[PDB]
Amino acid sequence: MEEVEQTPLQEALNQLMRQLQRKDPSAFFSFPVTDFIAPGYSMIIKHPMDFSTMKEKIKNNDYQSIEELKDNFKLMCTNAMIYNKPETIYYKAAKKLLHSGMKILSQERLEHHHHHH
């Protein structure tokens, strides 16, 4: 019992990532950072968890909880801002993405309006 209910959840999460990635800033972080794609994320930020890595995990039911998505998504945002000073749009990109991901995250799990506090 209970198994097919996991598929529907994955669909909703995939929508949030797709809509969030479609924003603009995610276009740069839409792939696993490397020694070329990143200034040294793998060297300083051990667990960056890019939008590409996280989305791939969602397809495997790795992401099916608001806490799981936020923890990983937040890690990249926090890790991206720490290893990226306000140079041009990299700093703003991470901040803007965080706000976009948070607002969209409250779309898949909407009981009515709010929750508490």
Q: State the amino acid at position 83 in one-letter form.
A: Y
Q: Rounded to the nearest 5°, which phi and psi values hold at 2?
A: 65, 110
Q: DSSP 3-state assignment of 32?
A: coil
Q: Measure the N-to-C terminal CA separation of the chain; round to a whole number of Å.
A: 35
Experimental technique, in short, is NMR
The values of phi and psi at residue 102, to 5°, are -65, -50
* Tokens at 40, concatenated: 């040294």
Enter the tokens of residue 94: 């991470």
**Calpha distance 23→104 (Å, rounded):** 11
List C-alpha distances in Å: 73 to 7, 55, 62: 21, 10, 13
Q: Report whether 20 contacts 100 (CB < 8 A).
A: yes
* Pair 77, 71: CB distance under 8 Å: no
Which helix (DSSP H) or strand (DSSP E) does residue 14 occupy? helix 6-21
Chain breaks in the chain (C to N over 2.5 A) after: none
Q: Which helix (H) or strand (E) holds 66?
A: helix 66-82
Residue 96 makes CB contacts below 8 A (sequence gap 6+) with 23, 25
* Structural domains in the chain, sorted by start: 1-117 (1.20.920.10)
C-alpha span between 12 and 37 (Å, rounded): 29
Question: What does the alpha-carbon distance between residue 69 and residue 55 come to, in Å, rounded to a whole number?
Answer: 10
For every residue of 90-111, DSSP letters joined together read HHHHHHHHHHHHHHHHHHHT-S
* Contact present, 79 and 48 (Cβ < 8 Å): yes
